[PDB]
Amino acid sequence: KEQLMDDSFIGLTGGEIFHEMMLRHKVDTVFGYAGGAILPVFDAIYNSDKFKFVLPRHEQGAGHMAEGYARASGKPGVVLVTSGPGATNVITPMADALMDGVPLVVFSGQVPTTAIGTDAFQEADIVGISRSCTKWNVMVKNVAELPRRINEAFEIATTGRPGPVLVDLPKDVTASILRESIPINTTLPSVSEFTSEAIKRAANILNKAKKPIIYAGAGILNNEQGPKLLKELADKANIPVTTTLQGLGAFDQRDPKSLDMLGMHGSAAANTAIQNADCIIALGARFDDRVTGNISKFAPEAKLAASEGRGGILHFEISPKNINKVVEATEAIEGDVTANLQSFIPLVDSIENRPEWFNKINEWKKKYPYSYQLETPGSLIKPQTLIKEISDQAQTYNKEVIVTTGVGQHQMWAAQHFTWTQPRTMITSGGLGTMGYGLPAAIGAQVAKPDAIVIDIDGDASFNMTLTELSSAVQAGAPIKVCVLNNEEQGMVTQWQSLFYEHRYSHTHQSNPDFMKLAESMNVKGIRITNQQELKSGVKEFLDATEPVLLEVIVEKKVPVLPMVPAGKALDDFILWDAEVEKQQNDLRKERTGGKY
Amino acid sequence: KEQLMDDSFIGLTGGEIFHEMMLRHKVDTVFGYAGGAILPVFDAIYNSDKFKFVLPRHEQGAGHMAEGYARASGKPGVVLVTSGPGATNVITPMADALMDGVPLVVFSGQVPTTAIGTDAFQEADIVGISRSCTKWNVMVKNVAELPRRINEAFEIATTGRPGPVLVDLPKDVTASILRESIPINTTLPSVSEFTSEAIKRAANILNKAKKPIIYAGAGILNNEQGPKLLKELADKANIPVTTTLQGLGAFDQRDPKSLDMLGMHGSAAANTAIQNADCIIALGARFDDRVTGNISKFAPEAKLAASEGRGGILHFEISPKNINKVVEATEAIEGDVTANLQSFIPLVDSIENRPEWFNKINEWKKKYPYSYQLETPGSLIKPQTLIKEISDQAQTYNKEVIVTTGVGQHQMWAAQHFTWTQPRTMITSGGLGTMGYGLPAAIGAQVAKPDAIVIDIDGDASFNMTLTELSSAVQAGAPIKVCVLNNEEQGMVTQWQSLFYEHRYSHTHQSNPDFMKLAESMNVKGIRITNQQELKSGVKEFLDATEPVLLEVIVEKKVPVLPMVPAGKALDDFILWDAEVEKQQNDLRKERTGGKY
Amino acid sequence: FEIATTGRPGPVLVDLPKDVTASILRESIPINTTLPSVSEFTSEAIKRAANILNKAKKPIIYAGAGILNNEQGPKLLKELADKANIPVTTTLQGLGAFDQRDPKSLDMLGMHGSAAANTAIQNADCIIALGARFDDRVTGNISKFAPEAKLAASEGRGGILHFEISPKNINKVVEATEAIEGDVTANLQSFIPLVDSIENRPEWFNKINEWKKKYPY
Ligand SMILES: Cc1cc2nc3c(=O)[nH]c(=O)nc-3n(C[C@H](O)[C@H](O)[C@H](O)COP(=O)(O)OP(=O)(O)OC[C@H]3O[C@@H](n4cnc5c(N)ncnc54)[C@H](O)[C@@H]3O)c2cc1C
Ligand SMILES: Cc1cc2nc3c(=O)[nH]c(=O)nc-3n(C[C@H](O)[C@H](O)[C@H](O)COP(=O)(O)OP(=O)(O)OC[C@H]3O[C@@H](n4cnc5c(N)ncnc54)[C@H](O)[C@@H]3O)c2cc1C
Ligand SMILES: Cc1cc2nc3c(=O)[nH]c(=O)nc-3n(C[C@H](O)[C@H](O)[C@H](O)COP(=O)(O)OP(=O)(O)OC[C@H]3O[C@@H](n4cnc5c(N)ncnc54)[C@H](O)[C@@H]3O)c2cc1C
Ligand SMILES: C/C(=C(/S)CCOP(=O)(O)OP(=O)(O)O)N(C=O)Cc1cnc(C)nc1N
Ligand SMILES: C/C(=C(/S)CCOP(=O)(O)OP(=O)(O)O)N(C=O)Cc1cnc(C)nc1N
Ligand SMILES: CCOC(=O)c1ccccc1S(=O)(=O)NC(=O)Nc1nc(Cl)cc(OC)n1
Ligand SMILES: CCOC(=O)c1ccccc1S(=O)(=O)NC(=O)Nc1nc(Cl)cc(OC)n1
Ligand SMILES: [K+]
Ligand SMILES: [K+]
Ligand SMILES: [Mg+2]
Ligand SMILES: [Mg+2]
């Protein structure tokens, strides 16, 4: 009885209890910003030596920083903000975290319980507003339930498909003192036969397959053994591997079995292979609409195989909501993909060779490289070339390399032209696609991994969204490396306007600040590369820097990302790069715009 | 029949119909930012000469710009953004607009109807998320109902208490073409006996009053004749006038009847007067908790008068929700306050003199000025003095002067020390209290009033939130004037930490960029005032500038805003400025922080 | 009234505060409010659906409540079944849409439906779904539903042709080979003239008649 109750927190404020529970959940970093409603918590964590506190310039920054932290570390990112505008400012990061499966634990101050529902000073209905962009939220109503609500939040955030949760903290609750004992369980943090039979059935299906392919995504990264078991499966059964944008780094792209990224802007080889495979092994990926192309025309050969009892789609997925949501799984294997792979692989027949299949695959890889128009004398640097340069030079340091991005063409080129080899090194906003993500994510990732090289490959329009957080990087002691691909345009949107709206560029050219004077004002090192001859040495100075650094690179404008699967088209119905076509496109654009673009 | 149907829109896309309806609603300005889902609308408004388009750097900027535009102009502010993160980025401005009664019409792109509910690319449930921070929202489901939904949005935004609405626009709807005729009514924009009796009763109550006071707020500004009728009432019945923060400018503060601002940081004279009045005439104000002080102790004399049938509270309010929400109205007069004043005033007895009442009031004004510690030799500029300087010099131009603010101490000092004389010249975030509001609001206000002087009185922490929008001011041709009060602290929060948390400054000092190099990078004129001797000439250069200009002023740190009604205290239980107390506070702060602050 | 009766019909509620219904109208109102009330994409889908049916060797009509939401519904259902010589099964809610005395009638399908109807749908190469939503009382185990029609779809010689008015119910339970959006009766008027008349299906109807004989209630 007395063994089941705890009185060790009696006499503490809600704020102090918060502090203690952070410690018990092994929180080493908090991202946040103060305000009137959250002052009792800020008073309790005053000069704490138990975790690092990171102060942004804007709560959106705190949110994206916590996301970057979470994706780099595999731990939940913790956010601490005030009521009202402090809390509504974290909504985009929460929606972002939900779409990309990021464990985010948001604590928001709230007006006193006696003031809730009165349209009080700095009162927002954050529980109502954040409901659709969290896995779960709650408003703590008294200090006695505060430890329990904190436990539940961390548990929900990190289990199933990871995602954001919000915990609302009324000021009178965090200021109040615990006077009663509480269940000791609340003061501490934390294979079905049906699934076993599904695994056996899945193995038998794969053991019949003649053209298998692994389609791997973010879920394989949610276990340290994930990439290891993926490689073990691919080696044993001799299977080519393609990944999503969010799966980049799960498989060593230097391996001959690597088909690179699939999808709208993925490799035409990967896209061809998945459209011709008789068995698709989907490992922690959700068949997003950037990946599948036209859904009714997706994976024709695997559907045929399924109907003929010799193949199909084997879906390893932890969230039942995402099983049979987009495409029918021939076998659904529910639970953690890594754990289920341990049971799967020993049932899978070892295969030495697949001559006809790998002959096709090798032929496809050869005819479908990421081709583009190279520099010519006097031309600007091509964005594709810049990415290759950064990738090549970065690999030569004896440090881990982590990449974050903004959203747009630069993001796709980063995905295509880097060589991905390590897990949790691509940190990018994929589901929601939030411009401005790049810089604060890099800061969060850098705090999680102080010895890593962290590179933010950013667009000029994206960078403009959140560039005030440069000051935050300095104050946090985070030596991030920001590379702005300055094409002086919202390139991804102008690409669509070029292609579908006859070169009518409607409000897609924002004016840029002087990025070198900007960096100087922020106390950050600045480097500007303006021509081909400065590329190599400029990138080296960038990577050699031991302080926060902003590199601006002037790059070619009005260049499309290719290959491209246009909306409505089958995954293997792609547009490929062609030199003559690009030249004609340039002439057309010039004529139509009176030579303006 | 054919007279009631319209076919003039047949053949147009949803995007083109949007364009036409903007014209019909007399929209002259749109604030927005492009994206994939909203491209059919952006294509339709391409090179439109029918309205000015303003491009921010961040959709939060668009939102606050539209708010500034709306408050300066009295027209709805129109926002046009894309799906997903474009739309979630407008949530803080929407919550802001709701709390402050600002007519905001937000149009957000959405993924095609065929993709909704699939966790699609850049899909957010913005209708669900924005529900609690809009008056009303809707998702348009086909092009035939688009004109009707646009009409409803503008109508709801601008009637009753004005507020934000959101209209969600699926891409396939805006791309689709109208093939059918629609009701011609949808293609065009738009005194009860009970209230009449209430007015008569209210007049009889006022005609008995011996200590009346007018408590006027934002609602009086929602009609051009508002301030005129307020003055007519105050003159005829000889009544002193106090206003809220949001009512500043409704009454000429140079008039002897002016009691200035009431509330937490309002004049102790105004606060004393309302606590002693036997009749309170509340004109378009909602008894917010920043104004009332301790509610149970609010307006004792008016409650007594009500019980004795010789006075009370007469509440002129347009929204039934806000009648009898906080305090009981003796008489509730529902509807537009200006219209109801036209019926009220002729029933009100003219009064020539109130010797005993105005003797008290004049005595109170004399003993309760906005006192503070003046500069001393070698000291930094006092923030209160800076505000007075700007106010005095700005009044000497032959132009309208509009002021926006950030949120914090600078905001309160701006409210106190400017002399307010004209309606719609205070544009400040009061209900939600959003830091970062100042700069984009100024841009919106400047676009609404191209011939006005627009001054953003901003805090350094507030300015950091949204400083990227400096580029937007330049690209928009908006010659705003930004004054950053640089105390190198989140002053309002450090004031509370000084007073209630024993000078424990927990994470309330963010590092600032070099504001002069920042302005230079943004192509904005920069002025820095660092000492008392530069104050006058620096402010003159600031106001004489004919281009966007950023003025940084180094001001005294750790100075409290006074007077102050602390939480829980009655409105007339205020802290006043005292020179000796300030000195002791300084010594205490110095000792406790080891001389750090 | 408009929302209740259009799309898939359904319930609506209108809440009427007492002071509103007691109050008197003092102002004029838009005269429109005082009175009650084929896409190329769908046309192409219909043509494609017809071509699919014209290849079919074991077709079956699966008809439900939606066919009853137009007076001409049952008429056009019968016209289609006669012209292309197709056996007809219905849901519980579709009962009465087709004359069960007709030799083409397979009776009700589903959990407690005719084993003949259930056998027939599991063996059909083309399923014409007319105003029915593939409810879980009807489909049985979903992954094992309509094996022959899925095979036919993959081999480009059949599949599921779904005539449905509510987009929410298209591709909700089973993937439609062709989705024909809108009122099923109206879309049948466009569909039937593109459909090849068939006089006999000896092997198919031999199976069907055998199934009806061995599976009475
Ligand atoms: C401009 C732009 C273009 C894009 N184009 C492409 C493109 O061409 N190709 C591409 O791939 N992406 C592209 N995307 C990104 C795309 O939108 C998606 O974000 C991405 O494809 C999702 O990848 P994912 O399924 O691996 O990750 P997620 O979206 O996170 O899905 C992971 C799945 O695995 C499950 N899971 C999680 N944990 C586990 C576990 N422990 N065990 C089992 N299952 C688990 C999850 O529940 C979920 O169903 C683009 C994005 C942008 C902004
Ligand atoms: C740091 C800080 C300190 C603050 N301290 C103070 C302070 O000391 N003093 C102070 O006053 N404020 C203060 N505030 C601001 C305060 O929070 C409120 O925002 C403000 O008092 C509201 O003023 P209001 O009632 O006039 O405007 P609103 O909040 O807009 O309320 C207007 C009312 O009038 C009604 N109305 C609207 N239109 C009409 C119409 N046509 N006819 C009739 N009625 C209509 C509305 O429905 C509403 O009920 C502070 C804000 C901050 C950020
Ligand atoms: C104890 C019990 C046992 C049951 N067992 C069975 C069983 O064995 N067999 C069986 O069939 N049912 C059974 N049911 C009933 C079953 O649950 C469903 O209610 C029924 O099958 C639904 O039939 P339906 O699809 O035709 O009608 P609905 O549920 O109404 O679906 C009609 C579909 O047609 C669409 N539609 C509507 N109007 C139009 C239009 N104008 N044009 C095009 N489309 C339109 C609708 O949007 C909808 O998708 C049972 C019920 C109970 C209580
Ligand atoms: C406008 C836009 C995009 S991606 C513009 C991208 O601009 P930039 O950073 O210069 O990248 P790029 O030139 O290398 O392509 N959007 C599409 O994704 C819409 C969008 C709009 N707003 C936000 C916050 N996020 C978004 N993704
Ligand atoms: C932190 C804070 C405030 S007001 C800090 C204000 O900083 P600053 O701009 O330098 O003004 P000041 O020094 O003249 O007072 N908050 C209280 O209102 C909390 C807050 C936090 N975040 C947002 C977006 N808005 C807020 N109001
Ligand atoms: C800003 C948070 O405000 C509140 O929490 C709040 C809201 C409504 C009623 C009472 C309070 S309170 O009395 O419990 N707390 C405050 O009012 N705090 C407060 N903090 C700061 Cl830094 C400033 C301020 O008024 C400007 N008020
Ligand atoms: C970004 C908006 O995306 C959508 O609207 C969207 C979402 C899900 C499915 C189909 C579409 S769509 O086919 O109707 N439109 C697009 O996919 N548009 C699109 N626009 C840009 Cl500028 C980029 C892009 O992919 C990167 N996609
Ligand atoms: K690569
Ligand atoms: K004043
Ligand atoms: Mg760009
Ligand atoms: Mg400050």
Query: Domain spans of chain A?
Result: 1-189, 190-369, 370-597
Question: Burial, B219: exposed, middle or buried (Cβ in 10 Å; 0-12, 13-18, 19+)?
Answer: buried
List, comma-separated, the residues after which chain B is broken, a break being a C to N distance over 2.5 A; otherwise answer none.
Answer: 190
Question: From CA B226, how far away is CA B217, in angstroms rounded?
Answer: 11
CATH superfamily of A190-369: TPP-binding domain (3.40.50.1220)
State the ligand closest to the CA atom of B288: 2
Q: Which residue of A has its CA nearest to B35?
A: A493
Amino acid sitting at position A530: T
Contact (CB, 8 A) for A181 and A10: yes
- φ and ψ of A252, to 5 deg: -70, 110
User: Which residues does C34 contact at the CB level (< 8 Å), separation at least 6?
Assistant: none
Question: From CA B9, how far away is CA A589, in angstroms rounded?
Answer: 31
Pocket of ligand 2 (CB under 6 A): A 121; B 100-101, 161, 217-219, 222-223, 244-247, 261-266, 284-286, 288, 290-291, 316-319, 322, 336-337, 407, 411-412, 430-431, 433, 492
Both tokens assigned to A414: 């980063």
Question: From CA B35, how far away is CA A493, in angstroms rounded?
Answer: 6
**Biggest CA pair distance of chain A:** 85
3-class SS letters over B341-369: HHHHHHHCCCCCCCHHHHHHHHHHHHHCC
- φ and ψ of B313, to 5 deg: -115, 120
Question: What separation in Å is there between the alpha carbon of A250 and the centre of ligand 6?
Answer: 48
Contact (CB, 8 A) for B247 and B217: yes
DSSP codes, B78-138: EEEE-STHHHHTTHHHHHHHHHHT--EEEEEEE--TTTTTS--TT---HHHHTGGGSSEEE
Contact (CB, 8 A) for A401 and A543: no
The terminus-to-terminus CA distance of chain C in angstroms comes to 42
State the Cα torsion A413-A415-A421-A426 to the nearest 10°. Answer: 130
3-class SS letters over B180-223: CCEEHHHHCCCCCHHHHHHHHHHHHHHHHCCCEEEEECHHHHHC
**Biggest CA pair distance of chain B:** 85
- Measured over the CA atoms of residue B148, residue B153, residue B156 and residue B159, the dihedral's sign is negative
Contact (CB, 8 A) for A561 and A409: yes
Contact (CB, 8 A) for A101 and A126: no
Of A456, A464, A482, A486, nearest to A556 by C-alpha is: A486
CA-to-CA separations, B497 to B19, B178, B263, B392, B596, in angstroms, rounded: 51, 60, 21, 33, 15
Nearest CA to ligand 3 atom 27: C65
Interface of B with A in 471-510 (CB under 8 A): 471, 474-475, 490, 492-493, 496-497, 500-501, 504, 506-508, 510
Of B110, B107, B207, nearest to B157 by C-alpha is: B107
Whether residue A521 and residue B523 make contact (CB cut-off 8 A), yes or no, is no
Instruction: Give, as one character, the DSSP assignment of residue A190.
Output: -
Question: What separation in Å is there between the alpha carbon of B467 and the centre of ligand 9?
Answer: 28
Contact (CB, 8 A) for B484 and B460: yes
Q: Which residues pair with B417 in a beta bridge?
A: none
Element (H, E) at A413: helix A409-417
| CA-angle at B84, arms to B83 and B90, nearest 5° | 85
Contact (CB, 8 A) for C89 and C115: no
CA-to-CA separations, B425 to A413, B217, B428, B450, in angstroms, rounded: 48, 13, 10, 14
Question: Burial, A408: exposed, middle or buried (Cβ in 10 Å; 0-12, 13-18, 19+)?
Answer: buried
Of A79, A42, A50, nearest to A63 by C-alpha is: A79
Whether residue A506 and residue B92 make contact (CB cut-off 8 A), yes or no, is no
CATH superfamily of B1-189: Thiamin diphosphate (ThDP)-binding fold, Pyr/PP domains (3.40.50.970)
The experimental technique used to determine this model is X-ray
Does residue C59's CB lie within 6 angstroms of at least one atom of ligand 3?
Answer: no
CA-to-CA separations, A385 to A545, A564, C130, in angstroms, rounded: 21, 19, 56
Question: What separation in Å is there between the alpha carbon of A86 and the centre of ligand 5?
Answer: 10
Contact (CB, 8 A) for C162 and C128: no
Question: From CA A303, how far away is CA C151, in angstroms rounded?
Answer: 9
Q: Which residues pair with C88 in a beta bridge?
A: C61, C105
Both tokens assigned to C149: 């029609």
The verdict on C30 touching B (C-beta cutoff 8 Å) is yes
Q: What is the CA radius of gyration of chain C?
A: 20
Of C30, C102, C24, nearest to C63 by C-alpha is: C102
3-class SS letters over chain C: CHHHHCCCCCCCCCCCCHHHHHCCCCCCCCHHHHCCCCCHHHHHHHHHHHHHHHHCCCEEEEECHHHHHCCCHHHHHHHHHHHHCCCEEECHHHCCCCCCCCCCEEEECCCCCCHHHHHHHHHCCEEEEECCCCCCCCCCCHHHCCHHHHHHHHCCCCEEEEEECCHHHCCCCCCCCEEEECCHHHHHHHHHHHCCCCCCCHHHHHHHHHHHHHCCC
Alpha carbons within 13 A on the beta-carbon side of A118: 20
Q: Which of B100, B102, B161, B424 to mutate for ligand 2's pocket (most ligand atoms within 8 Å of CB)?
A: B161
Which of B181, B185, B194, B195 to mutate to test binding with chain C, by most C CBs within 10 Å of its CB?
B185
| CA-angle at A397, arms to A392 and A398, nearest 5° | 140
Contact (CB, 8 A) for A520 and B65: no
Sheet of C59-63, strand order:
C105-108, C88-90, C59-63, C126-130, C159-164, C178-181
State the ligand closest to the CA atom of B124: 7
Mark B531-551 as b/e (b = at least 16 C-beta within 10 Å).
ebebbeebbeebbebeebbbb
Of A166, A172, A168, nearest to A113 by C-alpha is: A172
How many C-beta atoms surround the C-beta of residue B398 within 10 A?
Answer: 4
Packed helices A91-100 and A59-73: angle between N→C axes, nearest 10 degrees: 20
User: Which residues does C128 contact at the CB level (< 8 Å), separation at least 6?
Assistant: C53, C59, C60, C61, C62, C80, C86, C161, C163
User: Which residues does A568 contact at the CB level (< 8 Å), separation at least 6?
Assistant: A294
Domains B1-189 and B190-369 belong to one CATH topology: yes
Question: From CA B458, how far away is CA B464, in angstroms rounded?
Answer: 10
Both tokens assigned to A23: 């410690």
Contact (CB, 8 A) for A461 and A490: yes
Instruction: Give, as one character, the DSSP assignment of residue B382.
Output: P
Residue A61's SS3 state is helix
Pairing state of beta strands A182-183 and A5-6? antiparallel
Alpha carbons within 13 A on the beta-carbon side of B590: 6
DSSP codes, A438-488: HHHHHHHHHHH-TTSEEEEEEEHHHHHHHGGGHHHHHHHT---EEEEEE-S
The verdict on A537 touching C (C-beta cutoff 8 Å) is no
Question: From CA B19, how far away is CA A48, in angstroms rounded?
Answer: 56
Q: Which residues pair with C115 in a beta bridge?
A: none
Question: What separation in Å is there between the alpha carbon of A125 and the centre of ligand 5?
Answer: 20
Q: Collect all residues of chain C within an 8 Å Cβ-Cβ radius of residue A296.
A: 175
3-class SS letters over B515-561: HHHHHHHCCCEEEEECCHHHHHHHHHHHHHCCCCEEEEEEECCCCCC
Distance of CA C118 to the CA centre of its chain: 16
The terminus-to-terminus CA distance of chain A in angstroms comes to 78
Contact (CB, 8 A) for B89 and B58: yes
Contact (CB, 8 A) for B305 and B278: yes
User: Which residues does C159 contact at the CB level (< 8 Å), separation at least 6?
Assistant: C52, C126, C127, C149, C150, C152, C153, C176, C177, C178
Q: Which residue of A has its CA nearest to C178?
A: A296
Element (H, E) at A314: strand A312-317
Shortest CA gap A355–chain B (Å): 38
User: Which residues does A287 contact at the CB level (< 8 Å), separation at least 6?
Assistant: A325, A326, A327
Contact (CB, 8 A) for A346 and A310: no
User: Which residues does C77 contact at the CB level (< 8 Å), separation at least 6?
Assistant: C61, C63, C67, C88, C97, C98, C130, C188
C37-216: which CATH architecture? 3-Layer(aba) Sandwich (3.40)
Q: Which residues pair with B258 in a beta bridge?
A: B241
Question: From CA B302, how far away is CA B205, in angstroms rounded?
Answer: 11
Element (H, E) at B404: strand B401-405
The verdict on C143 touching B (C-beta cutoff 8 Å) is no
Contact (CB, 8 A) for B337 and B225: no
Of A135, A122, A105, nearest to A18 by C-alpha is: A105
State the ligand closest to the CA atom of B249: 9
Question: What separation in Å is there between the alpha carbon of B130 and the centre of ligand 11?
Answer: 31
Instruction: Give, as one character, the DSSP assignment of residue B576.
Output: -
User: Which residues does A355 contact at the CB level (< 8 Å), separation at least 6?
Assistant: none
Fold of A370-597: Rossmann fold (3.40.50)
Element (H, E) at B402: strand B401-405
Interface of C with B in 147-206 (CB under 8 A): 167
Question: Burial, B553: exposed, middle or buried (Cβ in 10 Å; 0-12, 13-18, 19+)?
Answer: buried
Which of B45, B47, B58, B100 to mutate to test binding with chain A, by most A CBs within 10 Å of its CB?
B58
The terminus-to-terminus CA distance of chain B in angstroms comes to 78
Of A577, A145, A234, nearest to A373 by C-alpha is: A577
Does residue A422's CB lie within 6 angstroms of at least one atom of ligand 1?
Answer: no
Amino acid sitting at position B166: L
Interface of B with A in 219-238 (CB under 8 A): none
The verdict on A567 touching C (C-beta cutoff 8 Å) is no
Place of tokens 């906080």: B326
The verdict on B513 touching A (C-beta cutoff 8 Å) is yes
Does residue A459's CB lie within 6 angstroms of at least one atom of ligand 1?
Answer: no
Nearest CA to ligand 6 atom 20: A36
3-class SS letters over B455-476: EEEEEHHHHHHHHHHHHHHHHH
Q: What number does the ligand 6 atom closest to the CA of A120 have?
A: 8
Contact (CB, 8 A) for B199 and B333: yes
Question: From CA A578, how far away is CA A368, in angstroms rounded?
Answer: 12
Residue B579's SS3 state is helix
Both tokens assigned to A182: 């509480």
Question: From CA C79, how far away is CA C61, in angstroms rounded?
Answer: 12
- φ and ψ of C56, to 5 deg: -70, 145
Whether residue A55 and residue B464 make contact (CB cut-off 8 A), yes or no, is no
Whether residue C151 and residue A300 make contact (CB cut-off 8 A), yes or no, is no
Q: From the annotation, which residues of C make up the binding site?
A: 8, 65, 69, 91-92, 109, 112, 133, 135, 137, 164, 169, 183-184
DSSP codes, B416-455: HHS---STT-EE---SS--TT-HHHHHHHHHHH-TTSEEE
Contact (CB, 8 A) for B21 and B150: yes
Both tokens assigned to B353: 């003199």
Both tokens assigned to B22: 């903007």
Element (H, E) at B280: strand B279-283
